Amino acid sequence: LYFVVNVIIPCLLFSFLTGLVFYLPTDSGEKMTLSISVLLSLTVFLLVIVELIPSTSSAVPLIGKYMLFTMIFVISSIIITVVVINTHHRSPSTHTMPQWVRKIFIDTIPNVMFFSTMKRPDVKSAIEGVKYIAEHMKSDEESSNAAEEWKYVAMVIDHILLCVFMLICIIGTVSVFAGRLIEL
Amino acid sequence: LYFVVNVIIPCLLFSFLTGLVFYLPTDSGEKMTLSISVLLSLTVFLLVIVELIPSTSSAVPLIGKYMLFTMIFVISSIIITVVVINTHHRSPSTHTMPQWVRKIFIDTIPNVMFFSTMKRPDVKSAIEGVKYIAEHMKSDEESSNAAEEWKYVAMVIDHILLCVFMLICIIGTVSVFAGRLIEL
Amino acid sequence: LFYIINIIAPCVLISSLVVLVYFLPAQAGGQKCTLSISVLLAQTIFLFLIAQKVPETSLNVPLIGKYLIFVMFVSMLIVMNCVIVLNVSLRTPNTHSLSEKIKHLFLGFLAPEIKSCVEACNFIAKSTKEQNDSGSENENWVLIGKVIDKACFWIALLLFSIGTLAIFLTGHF
Amino acid sequence: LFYIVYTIIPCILISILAILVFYLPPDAGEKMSLSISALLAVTVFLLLLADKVPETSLSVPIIIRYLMFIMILVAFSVILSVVVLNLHHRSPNTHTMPNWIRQIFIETLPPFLWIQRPQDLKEAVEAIKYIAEQLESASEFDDLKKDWQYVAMVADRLFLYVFFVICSIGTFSIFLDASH
Amino acid sequence: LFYVINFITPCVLISFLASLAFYLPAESGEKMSTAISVLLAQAVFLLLTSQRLPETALAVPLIGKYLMFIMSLVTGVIVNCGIVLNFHFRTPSTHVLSTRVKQIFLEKLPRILHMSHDEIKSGIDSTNYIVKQIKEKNAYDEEVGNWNLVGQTIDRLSMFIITPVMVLGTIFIFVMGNFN
């Protein structure tokens, strides 16, 4: 009871939060805020754990095992969040969307996400000037469409990753501890 | 040797980082981020000193004086950074540039900065509307020019302060440390 | 085994995070500096952590302390390079000058109412043209920044891997 | 007295912070700074308490119980801030606003909560018409986005009030119970 | 001397840095950042001071009384910074600019503080639409500029009102304390 309350519960909370980061839309530019603050909280808690658990070396304790899994869990989260941000801000000038990315993440995947709510004289000069303004607006709209397609792809990746990372947190959590729980 | 690697090297890193903020442009909203985080790092380091050096009260140690110097150094850099960001966003409507400010910081000092590379029916309704659009562009460009003049003053201030700050860093460091070091 | 499980592996994991900064965008909102300076703060925490394990004699620096200093310094270099990329990508023809050298290296190898209406239309088109020019220059500088991202990514990956493997396989032998 | 100062005063000021995060406008882009920095404070207070409570493992002292309760309250305030920010930054390109959200949060709650808010001429005409159309399209897109963000706004106000009540009452009760 | 050098001067400096928040413009979105890091350092000083004294409860030491008072002052500055950004960003669609506020902050204080062929028809319709949208945006923008000007004038007045207050409070306490 003492060790549960004083050690394990805080670690559960931080695992949950880090998992939550994937529901934050990329349009709110605060993905790096949240993920790096979670990482610093995790580092500090590493500090805590070494402060608390015994310093034996015979064998890896259960808390040791669990701490290692938690560290990898946080790290993965952070790296995929960076990945999404980088995908969203993908320059069309230097990159071209592969056909299979578009087919998979824009067309099919959003459709199988049922529980989600995501979308599935001088008059001639004047006239020429007006025409130029209109055609420039056309070209700007085209550029903006390509950018919006990239943002749409990011959003639908966030949805899918939110599902996926809840699943991974569950699976890993059950596996790490069920053996020892049943042993007691 | 033990004291050098254990104390002075980390302090050298932090000192070097301090002045780096002044080469970072104001466009990136992260001048206060970076400088305040450097300050916090130094304040945290004060723990390291306190936990490492002897806890006598007879007199102030050499590294005590050096760390006080470094405190004041950091705090000056951060104050000037804030100043320049405040000046960059000043609005013409409220703040009119004093004549002496313009004479000094916009005309005089930029010339004497050699090292820097910084520069120194319906037809009537349609016609009236066209005229309206053109005058609105006029006005937009004018307000942007005023604001741009403020931004330009801020940028020149940053350059100048970079050069001054690097010199002061150097001077202060040498004087503080060499004198004791040679005795060892 | 005790040192590997309690000090070496946790330290290595945290320190390997500095190689992530090369996949953040190099423009405002990318937060290269936020991330990198936070990683440096964790590295400081590691230096404090190690002060508690090494022996108290002061005639030499231990090997592990040497290694910590080395990795901290490499992380600092990569934070510097993120900051430099941000500076390069936000450049403008007015503040800086995009030398053609850089361009080759990166963009290469790697009634009176009628007359007043027409005048106002012409002026509108001209203002739009001016604004678009300025912007075009800006996007050129963004594309240079993206090239530099790729190139620096590869440099940093190679450097970190090599450095770490060698230094920590010397101790194992 | 001793305990009042040395433990309760610092705690109080951190609880006021975490409450204040819900008065910050979502447009400021500073909710996560405030909230997560409050969470750092709470974990710091747990470190602070470690070296004052007795080292026995039969039970948990009341002061640690109150710290944990306060920690969980502060966490939930963070959580709800992150929800509000998620709501604010929704758009038609990502979400479809449901009828129940609109009915509950825009129509009903605000009054209860007291908020209440020639070829060449044809060519040139086509160009002008296009310009106008673009303008208008942007406006419509922004209007839907602003409906989302208005829903965020009203939920943020409601959380403000709720958390203020909750923190004040729980803190008071705990403290009097401890000082009797 | 030991306490003046090790205890009083670092804490005093750090607290003084809180006044800079008032000279940092609301447009530079970094008021919260700055204030919350200041608060964290003050937390740390409180932790430092708790370790230096015995656990008696006869009375709070003089330096403890001064730390309490000065922390509390600083925390009031942080809260007011947050409030100021809240005021700066209010708009007609959410707040009412009362006459008292107009009088105070737009007339009196600025002065006191010395502050500084149907296709062509449709194209004509589209250009008139462009102009209508531009006019609407201008009225919207000039009221938003009113709000901007309010914030600026609050900045100036806050500096001039707060720096002297901090200084006088500090001088009086410390001359009292120098006579001990």
Author numbering:
A (entry chain D), B (entry chain A): 212 to 331, 370 to 433
C (entry chain E): 220 to 329, 410 to 472
D (entry chain C): 218 to 334, 398 to 460
E (entry chain B): 226 to 341, 416 to 479
Paper passage:
pmcThe postsynaptic membrane at the synaptic junctions of electrocytes and striated muscle cells comprises a cholesterol-rich phospholipid bilayer, most densely populated by a single membrane-spanning protein, the nicotinic acetylcholine receptor. This well-characterized heteropentameric ion channel forms regular closely packed arrays, an organization thought to maximize the speed and magnitude of depolarization of the membrane in response to acetylcholine released into the synaptic cleft. The membrane-spanning portion of the acetylcholine receptor has four TM helices (M1–M4) and one submembrane helix, MX, comprising each of its five subunits (αγ, β, δ, αδ, γ). The nicotinic acetylcholine receptor at the nerve-muscle synapse resides in an asymmetric cholesterol-rich membrane, the inner leaflet of which consists largely of ordered lipid assemblies due to a high cholesterol concentration.
The present study is based on a 4.7 Å density map of the junctional receptor obtained from two helical families of tube. To characterize further the junctional receptor in relation to the nanodisc form, a model of the junctional form was obtained by fitting the nanodisc-solved structure to the density map, using real-space refinement. The junctional form of this protein, analyzed by cryo-EM of postsynaptic-membrane-derived tubular vesicles, has a tapered pore (Top) framed by a splayed arrangement of TM helices (Middle) and a symmetrical rim of MX helices lying flat against the inner (cytoplasmic) bilayer surface (Bottom). In addition, time-resolved experiments on the tubular vesicles have shown that loop C of the αγ subunit closes around the binding site, and that the pore widens, on brief exposure to acetylcholine, indicating that the (unreacted) junctional receptor is in a closed (resting) and activatable state. In the junctional protein (gold), the upper portion of the pore is tapered (Top) due to the fact that the M2 helices separate from one another in the outer leaflet of the bilayer. Likewise, but to lesser extents, the other subunit–subunit interfaces are widened at this level in the structure. These small concerted changes together account for the observed splayed TM helical arrangement of the junctional receptor.
